[PDB]
Amino acid sequence: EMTHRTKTRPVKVGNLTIGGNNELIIQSMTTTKTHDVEATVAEIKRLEEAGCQVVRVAVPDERAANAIADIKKQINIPLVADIHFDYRLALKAIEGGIDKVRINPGNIGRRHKVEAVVNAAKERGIPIRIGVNAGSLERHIEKYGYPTADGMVESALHHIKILEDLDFHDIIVSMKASDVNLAIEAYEKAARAFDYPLHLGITESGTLFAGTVKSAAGLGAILNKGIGNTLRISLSADPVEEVKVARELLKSFGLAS
Amino acid sequence: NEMTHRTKTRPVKVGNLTIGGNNELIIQSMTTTKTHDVEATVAEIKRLEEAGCQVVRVAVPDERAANAIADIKKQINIPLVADIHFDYRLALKAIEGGIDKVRINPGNIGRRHKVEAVVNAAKERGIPIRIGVNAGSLERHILEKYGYPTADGMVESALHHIKILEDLDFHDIIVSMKASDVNLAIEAYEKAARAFDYPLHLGITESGTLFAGTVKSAAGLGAILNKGIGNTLRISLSADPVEEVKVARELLKSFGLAS
Amino acid sequence: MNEMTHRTKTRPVKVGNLTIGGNNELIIQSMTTTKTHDVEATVAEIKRLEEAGCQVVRVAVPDERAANAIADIKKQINIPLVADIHFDYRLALKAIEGGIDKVRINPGNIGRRHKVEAVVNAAKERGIPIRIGVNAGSLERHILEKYGYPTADGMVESALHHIKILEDLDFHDIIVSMKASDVNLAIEAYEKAARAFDYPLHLGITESGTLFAGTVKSAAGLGAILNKGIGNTLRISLSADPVEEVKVARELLKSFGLASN
Amino acid sequence: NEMTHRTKTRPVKVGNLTIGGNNELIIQSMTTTKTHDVEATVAEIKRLEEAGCQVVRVAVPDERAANAIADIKKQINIPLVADIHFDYRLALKAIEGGIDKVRINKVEAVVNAAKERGIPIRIGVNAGSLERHILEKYGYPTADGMVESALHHIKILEDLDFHDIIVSMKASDVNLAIEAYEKAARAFDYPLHLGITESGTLFAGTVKSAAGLGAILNKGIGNTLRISLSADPVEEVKVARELLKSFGLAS
Ligand SMILES: [Cl-]
Ligand SMILES: [Cl-]
Ligand SMILES: [Cl-]
Ligand SMILES: [Cl-]
Ligand SMILES: [Cl-]
């Protein structure tokens, strides 16, 4: 049985709550150099002007991690940081005021690294988004022979398990794929597999037109199931258009944000 | 109840094609020219043929439009379809004119001999009929029963059109459930798949700018295609009909439901 | 078995003051996206096209109001104009009387003897050429029933009958297009075309859904074709402004060291 | 000699992927980050992967990059290719770090390391860097010099019992690029790695590469391809898909 978006666990992200209500928070991400504070801030204010409620920035390095405080001081909406496995960058961004870190626990390595992150996260009440991706499933998951709905949830489970073992339940999860049937199938199962809020997203298509049609369709079928607490529409275009498609999708179903 | 999957629906012939009973959806659009202007309508259908359109609907508001069907036919490949709202003479004229499928409202037409001539006209010529229920066009008693347009009322209307034709030994039926509201559209099609075995023609009433029409159509149709129903479809957009085909092709590519 | 004729060996066919065929040049073309009857809009789109380097422009002539507007459009532009009419011969006669510089129509579609010889003699009198345009997606039913689906042999079967209708009227002022979506078919249709007849070929590829996909698919396909040494004129079809079509054609020709003259 | 069809080229493994012996080309891209900056590099690969990239090349200009190779692989799921130019040592380093393929042109020590790990070597021939003696023989860069340069390199590996070779024939002039791959395909049956060196703007490089590679693909050769652009690595994957997808050449 699927956990409706209204009975999912509430997760505080800055001043907003994701999960435990029927409000789909709109998110996006920047295209700028995260360490280029002026450019990043400029693009963020254009996203805020468009209707963006939460925005993510890639933190590939120290320059980027160092830019966090300077960015957040010049913005109004919550700022999430992208980090695949570097615990030092995780720690630097957290210290800097990020509102949430998108990091997959199982990639961090040795337990002491995993704890340095979770402890920092609890210290200032920041959540983690577990972001499962169809193109980047663990090497071992030689088990299915290719990305499948089952391989995504299992990878997801593994990541939640590490946080729950550390008494950490402030978690948001995403199951992002490029294929629509796999997309729908993945969120369906993750909703039946766990109670955390689901961050909806489909992989960027080659063109803006392809991506607009595919995402509108895939997320359309997921929202109709009563699931999803937040969403990000990924498109080969200026981020503002992602906010526009997201707004149009939610208005279409008569959904509030 | 059981949702009749698309592969479990009744196969009908629309020209040289088979709609229903399989796991593929045939793309359809409509010409924006006056059917009377032969070259104009052909020129537009040629662009749609080039684009990948598989079935095309032409305006048949009057007798001149109906009388040009054979001329259009000599110059194209794909099946020609036509919607007749009220006047049965237009349906009859279109049928004898060489149409491949007609969209009629048995209950509106009028006299029993009127419907019998069209049913027979279509039955004789071996042509299918499409029953198209539209949320904004429900019968008076339907709206009085439910109070406003609703999935159940569209389904009530559908069955009756179907029953009129079934009572005249007519079964080459395709059913459309067109609404503007996606929530209604999604429901309307889900209950139709549970209420009968005929193939369903998926369409959403166009609303807003091209940008909004494209998003809302993709959204609603995404939820319906994931339900495993739909055997044919058309995207409606105030734009060059070719754009409708583009959108339909992307949608099918996404789900892997193209012919 | 028959050798592909090299673009420099195709029959030279004059279009306006230009010569398509019997040379190593590739004439670049585009098509308007306006209503032909809207003279002002159409002439302004053509002027933008000329500015980007377009050499020949085709306009649809779907009704009588568009064919009567040919004369006034011609008076305002400096590049040869082309009427695209699928079969209505009263619309082509008007286009020809309007002073069109070429007509894109397939004679086997007209397709009544008094109707064919009329359009034929009218063109003969004005000394204007006819481009036959076979499109994989708009092939005749008797081809489809025979081959099953669109094939190169089928497109070649089609082109040959339209060509015969004309050759049988002692008309040889002909250019041929073989349009397909599938890049593999397009490539084979044009090599099969070069072996069957010596008429210069007009290279085109159906427009993909988007500008990006269209640019890649068309450069990849036409590049394949151009490298065989065939084709005498081309048109890129894109879901974009016609100016984008001219820019892709220029950069594509630039890539092969080929010129427009 | 007639050209060796892509389906008849000598199979070569790269990670879990086969390169050669089938009618489908593998998509490659290349990172732009500092290979020694691990999260940075991994982040780019992660976007590449998602976009449909199948193999990725990372620059190894020195030992910093060479040492990061292992940490990069424990994070990614597509095979990595190293690109070494002058130092035989950096290639040795990249191989110890688990590189899945080394693109390179002591000499026996590199092969022994390549033998030991069971990894191939992509001989990379380029029109912009042919040795002086073939330039002195042919006068300028040409298809005959390229194939001759590729054969002299193929010879040395073969004499050392190493046959797991993949070959590229890089040039900026479309007509030379075409002629070279045709020429290549005839001389040897090793799989071909298609690429066109970039020139001009993004617009210009997109048209040129698709045009050249289309002609090449039409001839039925090539088992792997790379679209060289000066932008986000995902733009190279975007061009590559449309191209392969248009010709009917799957993953
Ligand atoms: Cl570790
Ligand atoms: Cl450490
Ligand atoms: Cl727990
Ligand atoms: Cl009457
Ligand atoms: Cl409205």
Side-chain angles (χ1 to χ4, degrees), chain C residues 69-87:
Chain C
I70 294 301
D72 270 320
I73 288 170
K74 177 77 179 301
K75 189 187 184 69
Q76 306 193 45
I77 67 181
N78 297 335
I79 62 171
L81 189 68
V82 176
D84 187 293
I85 296 161
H86 296 265
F87 82 99

mmCIF file with all atom_site columns, all heavy atoms in Angstrom, chain C residues 69-87:
data_model
loop_
_atom_site.group_PDB
_atom_site.id
_atom_site.type_symbol
_atom_site.label_atom_id
_atom_site.label_alt_id
_atom_site.label_comp_id
_atom_site.label_asym_id
_atom_site.label_entity_id
_atom_site.label_seq_id
_atom_site.pdbx_PDB_ins_code
_atom_site.Cartn_x
_atom_site.Cartn_y
_atom_site.Cartn_z
_atom_site.occupancy
_atom_site.B_iso_or_equiv
_atom_site.pdbx_formal_charge
_atom_site.auth_seq_id
_atom_site.auth_comp_id
_atom_site.auth_asym_id
_atom_site.auth_atom_id
_atom_site.pdbx_PDB_model_num
ATOM 1   N N   . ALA C 1 69 ? -1.480 36.064 -55.671 1.00 0.00 ? 69 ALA C N   1
ATOM 2   C CA  . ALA C 1 69 ? -0.520 36.923 -54.957 1.00 0.00 ? 69 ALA C CA  1
ATOM 3   C C   . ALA C 1 69 ? 0.907  36.717 -55.439 1.00 0.00 ? 69 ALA C C   1
ATOM 4   O O   . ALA C 1 69 ? 1.810  37.463 -55.053 1.00 0.00 ? 69 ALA C O   1
ATOM 5   C CB  . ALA C 1 69 ? -0.603 36.656 -53.462 1.00 0.00 ? 69 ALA C CB  1
ATOM 6   N N   . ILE C 1 70 ? 1.126  35.687 -56.254 1.00 0.00 ? 70 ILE C N   1
ATOM 7   C CA  . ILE C 1 70 ? 2.476  35.396 -56.760 1.00 0.00 ? 70 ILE C CA  1
ATOM 8   C C   . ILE C 1 70 ? 3.068  36.580 -57.505 1.00 0.00 ? 70 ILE C C   1
ATOM 9   O O   . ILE C 1 70 ? 4.215  36.956 -57.261 1.00 0.00 ? 70 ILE C O   1
ATOM 10  C CB  . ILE C 1 70 ? 2.472  34.132 -57.662 1.00 0.00 ? 70 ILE C CB  1
ATOM 11  C CG1 . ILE C 1 70 ? 2.133  32.889 -56.833 1.00 0.00 ? 70 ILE C CG1 1
ATOM 12  C CG2 . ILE C 1 70 ? 3.796  33.963 -58.406 1.00 0.00 ? 70 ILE C CG2 1
ATOM 13  C CD1 . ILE C 1 70 ? 3.074  32.600 -55.675 1.00 0.00 ? 70 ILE C CD1 1
ATOM 14  N N   . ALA C 1 71 ? 2.287  37.177 -58.408 1.00 0.00 ? 71 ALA C N   1
ATOM 15  C CA  . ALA C 1 71 ? 2.767  38.322 -59.199 1.00 0.00 ? 71 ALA C CA  1
ATOM 16  C C   . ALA C 1 71 ? 3.352  39.444 -58.318 1.00 0.00 ? 71 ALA C C   1
ATOM 17  O O   . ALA C 1 71 ? 4.493  39.839 -58.517 1.00 0.00 ? 71 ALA C O   1
ATOM 18  C CB  . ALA C 1 71 ? 1.653  38.863 -60.106 1.00 0.00 ? 71 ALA C CB  1
ATOM 19  N N   . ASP C 1 72 ? 2.591  39.926 -57.336 1.00 0.00 ? 72 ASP C N   1
ATOM 20  C CA  . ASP C 1 72 ? 3.055  40.999 -56.413 1.00 0.00 ? 72 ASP C CA  1
ATOM 21  C C   . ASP C 1 72 ? 4.226  40.616 -55.489 1.00 0.00 ? 72 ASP C C   1
ATOM 22  O O   . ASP C 1 72 ? 4.958  41.500 -55.018 1.00 0.00 ? 72 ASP C O   1
ATOM 23  C CB  . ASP C 1 72 ? 1.908  41.526 -55.536 1.00 0.00 ? 72 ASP C CB  1
ATOM 24  C CG  . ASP C 1 72 ? 1.160  42.675 -56.159 1.00 0.00 ? 72 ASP C CG  1
ATOM 25  O OD1 . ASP C 1 72 ? 1.801  43.549 -56.781 1.00 0.00 ? 72 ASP C OD1 1
ATOM 26  O OD2 . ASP C 1 72 ? -0.069 42.763 -55.957 1.00 0.00 ? 72 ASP C OD2 1
ATOM 27  N N   . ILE C 1 73 ? 4.380  39.325 -55.186 1.00 0.00 ? 73 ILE C N   1
ATOM 28  C CA  . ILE C 1 73 ? 5.488  38.897 -54.340 1.00 0.00 ? 73 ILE C CA  1
ATOM 29  C C   . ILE C 1 73 ? 6.737  38.948 -55.200 1.00 0.00 ? 73 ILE C C   1
ATOM 30  O O   . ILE C 1 73 ? 7.773  39.460 -54.784 1.00 0.00 ? 73 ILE C O   1
ATOM 31  C CB  . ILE C 1 73 ? 5.299  37.471 -53.778 1.00 0.00 ? 73 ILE C CB  1
ATOM 32  C CG1 . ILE C 1 73 ? 4.206  37.465 -52.708 1.00 0.00 ? 73 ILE C CG1 1
ATOM 33  C CG2 . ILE C 1 73 ? 6.599  36.954 -53.162 1.00 0.00 ? 73 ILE C CG2 1
ATOM 34  C CD1 . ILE C 1 73 ? 3.777  36.098 -52.262 1.00 0.00 ? 73 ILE C CD1 1
ATOM 35  N N   . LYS C 1 74 ? 6.618  38.423 -56.410 1.00 0.00 ? 74 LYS C N   1
ATOM 36  C CA  . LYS C 1 74 ? 7.725  38.354 -57.349 1.00 0.00 ? 74 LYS C CA  1
ATOM 37  C C   . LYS C 1 74 ? 8.308  39.738 -57.613 1.00 0.00 ? 74 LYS C C   1
ATOM 38  O O   . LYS C 1 74 ? 9.531  39.898 -57.709 1.00 0.00 ? 74 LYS C O   1
ATOM 39  C CB  . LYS C 1 74 ? 7.245  37.685 -58.636 1.00 0.00 ? 74 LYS C CB  1
ATOM 40  C CG  . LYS C 1 74 ? 8.261  37.582 -59.768 1.00 0.00 ? 74 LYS C CG  1
ATOM 41  C CD  . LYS C 1 74 ? 9.286  36.478 -59.565 1.00 0.00 ? 74 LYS C CD  1
ATOM 42  C CE  . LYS C 1 74 ? 10.254 36.425 -60.739 1.00 0.00 ? 74 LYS C CE  1
ATOM 43  N NZ  . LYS C 1 74 ? 9.562  36.189 -62.043 1.00 0.00 ? 74 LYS C NZ  1
ATOM 44  N N   . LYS C 1 75 ? 7.440  40.745 -57.661 1.00 0.00 ? 75 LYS C N   1
ATOM 45  C CA  . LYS C 1 75 ? 7.865  42.113 -57.931 1.00 0.00 ? 75 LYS C CA  1
ATOM 46  C C   . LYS C 1 75 ? 8.711  42.746 -56.826 1.00 0.00 ? 75 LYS C C   1
ATOM 47  O O   . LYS C 1 75 ? 9.399  43.731 -57.070 1.00 0.00 ? 75 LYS C O   1
ATOM 48  C CB  . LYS C 1 75 ? 6.643  43.010 -58.163 1.00 0.00 ? 75 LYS C CB  1
ATOM 49  C CG  . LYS C 1 75 ? 6.992  44.405 -58.655 1.00 0.00 ? 75 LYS C CG  1
ATOM 50  C CD  . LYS C 1 75 ? 5.782  45.315 -58.705 1.00 0.00 ? 75 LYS C CD  1
ATOM 51  C CE  . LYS C 1 75 ? 6.150  46.669 -59.284 1.00 0.00 ? 75 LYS C CE  1
ATOM 52  N NZ  . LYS C 1 75 ? 6.468  46.598 -60.737 1.00 0.00 ? 75 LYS C NZ  1
ATOM 53  N N   . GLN C 1 76 ? 8.655  42.190 -55.623 1.00 0.00 ? 76 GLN C N   1
ATOM 54  C CA  . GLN C 1 76 ? 9.361  42.755 -54.498 1.00 0.00 ? 76 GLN C CA  1
ATOM 55  C C   . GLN C 1 76 ? 10.613 41.994 -54.059 1.00 0.00 ? 76 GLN C C   1
ATOM 56  O O   . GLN C 1 76 ? 11.376 42.507 -53.234 1.00 0.00 ? 76 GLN C O   1
ATOM 57  C CB  . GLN C 1 76 ? 8.397  42.849 -53.315 1.00 0.00 ? 76 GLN C CB  1
ATOM 58  C CG  . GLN C 1 76 ? 7.117  43.608 -53.625 1.00 0.00 ? 76 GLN C CG  1
ATOM 59  C CD  . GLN C 1 76 ? 6.355  43.945 -52.366 1.00 0.00 ? 76 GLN C CD  1
ATOM 60  O OE1 . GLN C 1 76 ? 6.937  44.402 -51.372 1.00 0.00 ? 76 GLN C OE1 1
ATOM 61  N NE2 . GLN C 1 76 ? 5.059  43.732 -52.394 1.00 0.00 ? 76 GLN C NE2 1
ATOM 62  N N   . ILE C 1 77 ? 10.831 40.792 -54.598 1.00 0.00 ? 77 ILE C N   1
ATOM 63  C CA  . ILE C 1 77 ? 11.992 39.977 -54.194 1.00 0.00 ? 77 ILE C CA  1
ATOM 64  C C   . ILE C 1 77 ? 13.033 39.839 -55.307 1.00 0.00 ? 77 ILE C C   1
ATOM 65  O O   . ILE C 1 77 ? 12.720 40.003 -56.486 1.00 0.00 ? 77 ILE C O   1
ATOM 66  C CB  . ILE C 1 77 ? 11.550 38.572 -53.750 1.00 0.00 ? 77 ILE C CB  1
ATOM 67  C CG1 . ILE C 1 77 ? 10.994 37.779 -54.951 1.00 0.00 ? 77 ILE C CG1 1
ATOM 68  C CG2 . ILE C 1 77 ? 10.527 38.683 -52.633 1.00 0.00 ? 77 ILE C CG2 1
ATOM 69  C CD1 . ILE C 1 77 ? 10.519 36.389 -54.608 1.00 0.00 ? 77 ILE C CD1 1
ATOM 70  N N   . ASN C 1 78 ? 14.259 39.516 -54.918 1.00 0.00 ? 78 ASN C N   1
ATOM 71  C CA  . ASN C 1 78 ? 15.375 39.346 -55.861 1.00 0.00 ? 78 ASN C CA  1
ATOM 72  C C   . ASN C 1 78 ? 15.888 37.916 -56.013 1.00 0.00 ? 78 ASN C C   1
ATOM 73  O O   . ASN C 1 78 ? 16.997 37.717 -56.506 1.00 0.00 ? 78 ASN C O   1
ATOM 74  C CB  . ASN C 1 78 ? 16.529 40.274 -55.461 1.00 0.00 ? 78 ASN C CB  1
ATOM 75  C CG  . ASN C 1 78 ? 16.151 41.738 -55.532 1.00 0.00 ? 78 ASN C CG  1
ATOM 76  O OD1 . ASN C 1 78 ? 15.244 42.127 -56.273 1.00 0.00 ? 78 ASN C OD1 1
ATOM 77  N ND2 . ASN C 1 78 ? 16.870 42.568 -54.781 1.00 0.00 ? 78 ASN C ND2 1
ATOM 78  N N   . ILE C 1 79 ? 15.116 36.922 -55.572 1.00 0.00 ? 79 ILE C N   1
ATOM 79  C CA  . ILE C 1 79 ? 15.521 35.519 -55.736 1.00 0.00 ? 79 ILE C CA  1
ATOM 80  C C   . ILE C 1 79 ? 14.401 34.742 -56.433 1.00 0.00 ? 79 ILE C C   1
ATOM 81  O O   . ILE C 1 79 ? 13.226 35.094 -56.314 1.00 0.00 ? 79 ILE C O   1
ATOM 82  C CB  . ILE C 1 79 ? 15.942 34.812 -54.425 1.00 0.00 ? 79 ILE C CB  1
ATOM 83  C CG1 . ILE C 1 79 ? 14.785 34.753 -53.401 1.00 0.00 ? 79 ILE C CG1 1
ATOM 84  C CG2 . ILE C 1 79 ? 17.171 35.487 -53.839 1.00 0.00 ? 79 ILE C CG2 1
ATOM 85  C CD1 . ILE C 1 79 ? 15.095 33.884 -52.181 1.00 0.00 ? 79 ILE C CD1 1
ATOM 86  N N   . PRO C 1 80 ? 14.768 33.677 -57.158 1.00 0.00 ? 80 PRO C N   1
ATOM 87  C CA  . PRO C 1 80 ? 13.754 32.911 -57.858 1.00 0.00 ? 80 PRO C CA  1
ATOM 88  C C   . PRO C 1 80 ? 12.733 32.339 -56.892 1.00 0.00 ? 80 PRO C C   1
ATOM 89  O O   . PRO C 1 80 ? 13.101 31.908 -55.811 1.00 0.00 ? 80 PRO C O   1
ATOM 90  C CB  . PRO C 1 80 ? 14.565 31.812 -58.537 1.00 0.00 ? 80 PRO C CB  1
ATOM 91  C CG  . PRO C 1 80 ? 15.883 32.453 -58.785 1.00 0.00 ? 80 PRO C CG  1
ATOM 92  C CD  . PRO C 1 80 ? 16.128 33.278 -57.562 1.00 0.00 ? 80 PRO C CD  1
ATOM 93  N N   . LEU C 1 81 ? 11.464 32.366 -57.286 1.00 0.00 ? 81 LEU C N   1
ATOM 94  C CA  . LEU C 1 81 ? 10.363 31.894 -56.462 1.00 0.00 ? 81 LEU C CA  1
ATOM 95  C C   . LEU C 1 81 ? 9.795  30.560 -56.983 1.00 0.00 ? 81 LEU C C   1
ATOM 96  O O   . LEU C 1 81 ? 9.812  30.286 -58.205 1.00 0.00 ? 81 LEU C O   1
ATOM 97  C CB  . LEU C 1 81 ? 9.276  32.957 -56.433 1.00 0.00 ? 81 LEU C CB  1
ATOM 98  C CG  . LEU C 1 81 ? 8.096  32.794 -55.469 1.00 0.00 ? 81 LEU C CG  1
ATOM 99  C CD1 . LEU C 1 81 ? 8.575  32.930 -54.035 1.00 0.00 ? 81 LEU C CD1 1
ATOM 100 C CD2 . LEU C 1 81 ? 7.008  33.822 -55.750 1.00 0.00 ? 81 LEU C CD2 1
ATOM 101 N N   . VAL C 1 82 ? 9.277  29.747 -56.056 1.00 0.00 ? 82 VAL C N   1
ATOM 102 C CA  . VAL C 1 82 ? 8.732  28.431 -56.388 1.00 0.00 ? 82 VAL C CA  1
ATOM 103 C C   . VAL C 1 82 ? 7.352  28.183 -55.785 1.00 0.00 ? 82 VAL C C   1
ATOM 104 O O   . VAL C 1 82 ? 7.157  28.296 -54.572 1.00 0.00 ? 82 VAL C O   1
ATOM 105 C CB  . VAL C 1 82 ? 9.664  27.293 -55.891 1.00 0.00 ? 82 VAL C CB  1
ATOM 106 C CG1 . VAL C 1 82 ? 9.043  25.914 -56.162 1.00 0.00 ? 82 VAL C CG1 1
ATOM 107 C CG2 . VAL C 1 82 ? 11.043 27.392 -56.536 1.00 0.00 ? 82 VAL C CG2 1
ATOM 108 N N   . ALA C 1 83 ? 6.406  27.823 -56.644 1.00 0.00 ? 83 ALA C N   1
ATOM 109 C CA  . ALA C 1 83 ? 5.055  27.468 -56.213 1.00 0.00 ? 83 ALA C CA  1
ATOM 110 C C   . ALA C 1 83 ? 4.999  25.983 -55.899 1.00 0.00 ? 83 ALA C C   1
ATOM 111 O O   . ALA C 1 83 ? 5.450  25.149 -56.693 1.00 0.00 ? 83 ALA C O   1
ATOM 112 C CB  . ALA C 1 83 ? 4.064  27.772 -57.296 1.00 0.00 ? 83 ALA C CB  1
ATOM 113 N N   . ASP C 1 84 ? 4.446  25.644 -54.740 1.00 0.00 ? 84 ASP C N   1
ATOM 114 C CA  . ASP C 1 84 ? 4.285  24.241 -54.348 1.00 0.00 ? 84 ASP C CA  1
ATOM 115 C C   . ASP C 1 84 ? 2.790  23.976 -54.368 1.00 0.00 ? 84 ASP C C   1
ATOM 116 O O   . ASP C 1 84 ? 2.000  24.545 -53.564 1.00 0.00 ? 84 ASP C O   1
ATOM 117 C CB  . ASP C 1 84 ? 4.904  23.935 -52.972 1.00 0.00 ? 84 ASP C CB  1
ATOM 118 C CG  . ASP C 1 84 ? 4.879  22.452 -52.641 1.00 0.00 ? 84 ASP C CG  1
ATOM 119 O OD1 . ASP C 1 84 ? 3.801  21.867 -52.441 1.00 0.00 ? 84 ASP C OD1 1
ATOM 120 O OD2 . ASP C 1 84 ? 5.945  21.857 -52.573 1.00 0.00 ? 84 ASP C OD2 1
ATOM 121 N N   . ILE C 1 85 ? 2.403  23.139 -55.320 1.00 0.00 ? 85 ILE C N   1
ATOM 122 C CA  . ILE C 1 85 ? 1.028  22.762 -55.557 1.00 0.00 ? 85 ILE C CA  1
ATOM 123 C C   . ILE C 1 85 ? 1.051  21.260 -55.782 1.00 0.00 ? 85 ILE C C   1
ATOM 124 O O   . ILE C 1 85 ? 1.803  20.773 -56.611 1.00 0.00 ? 85 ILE C O   1
ATOM 125 C CB  . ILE C 1 85 ? 0.499  23.434 -56.837 1.00 0.00 ? 85 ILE C CB  1
ATOM 126 C CG1 . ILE C 1 85 ? 0.481  24.955 -56.686 1.00 0.00 ? 85 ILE C CG1 1
ATOM 127 C CG2 . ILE C 1 85 ? -0.892 22.932 -57.167 1.00 0.00 ? 85 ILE C CG2 1
ATOM 128 C CD1 . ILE C 1 85 ? 0.419  25.678 -58.008 1.00 0.00 ? 85 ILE C CD1 1
ATOM 129 N N   . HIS C 1 86 ? 0.223  20.513 -55.066 1.00 0.00 ? 86 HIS C N   1
ATOM 130 C CA  . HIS C 1 86 ? 0.234  19.071 -55.238 1.00 0.00 ? 86 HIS C CA  1
ATOM 131 C C   . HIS C 1 86 ? -0.460 18.547 -56.485 1.00 0.00 ? 86 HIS C C   1
ATOM 132 O O   . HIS C 1 86 ? -0.012 17.547 -57.048 1.00 0.00 ? 86 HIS C O   1
ATOM 133 C CB  . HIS C 1 86 ? -0.316 18.390 -53.991 1.00 0.00 ? 86 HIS C CB  1
ATOM 134 C CG  . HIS C 1 86 ? 0.527  18.626 -52.788 1.00 0.00 ? 86 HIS C CG  1
ATOM 135 N ND1 . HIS C 1 86 ? 1.494  17.741 -52.369 1.00 0.00 ? 86 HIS C ND1 1
ATOM 136 C CD2 . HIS C 1 86 ? 0.601  19.689 -51.951 1.00 0.00 ? 86 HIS C CD2 1
ATOM 137 C CE1 . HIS C 1 86 ? 2.100  18.229 -51.304 1.00 0.00 ? 86 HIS C CE1 1
ATOM 138 N NE2 . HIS C 1 86 ? 1.571  19.407 -51.028 1.00 0.00 ? 86 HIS C NE2 1
ATOM 139 N N   . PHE C 1 87 ? -1.511 19.212 -56.954 1.00 0.00 ? 87 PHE C N   1
ATOM 140 C CA  . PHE C 1 87 ? -2.200 18.678 -58.135 1.00 0.00 ? 87 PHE C CA  1
ATOM 141 C C   . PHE C 1 87 ? -3.172 19.586 -58.880 1.00 0.00 ? 87 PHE C C   1
ATOM 142 O O   . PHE C 1 87 ? -3.341 19.422 -60.105 1.00 0.00 ? 87 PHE C O   1
ATOM 143 C CB  . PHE C 1 87 ? -3.039 17.459 -57.714 1.00 0.00 ? 87 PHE C CB  1
ATOM 144 C CG  . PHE C 1 87 ? -4.362 17.826 -57.113 1.00 0.00 ? 87 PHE C CG  1
ATOM 145 C CD1 . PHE C 1 87 ? -5.523 17.786 -57.892 1.00 0.00 ? 87 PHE C CD1 1
ATOM 146 C CD2 . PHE C 1 87 ? -4.459 18.236 -55.800 1.00 0.00 ? 87 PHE C CD2 1
ATOM 147 C CE1 . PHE C 1 87 ? -6.741 18.145 -57.358 1.00 0.00 ? 87 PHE C CE1 1
ATOM 148 C CE2 . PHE C 1 87 ? -5.686 18.594 -55.261 1.00 0.00 ? 87 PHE C CE2 1
ATOM 149 C CZ  . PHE C 1 87 ? -6.823 18.543 -56.038 1.00 0.00 ? 87 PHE C CZ  1
#
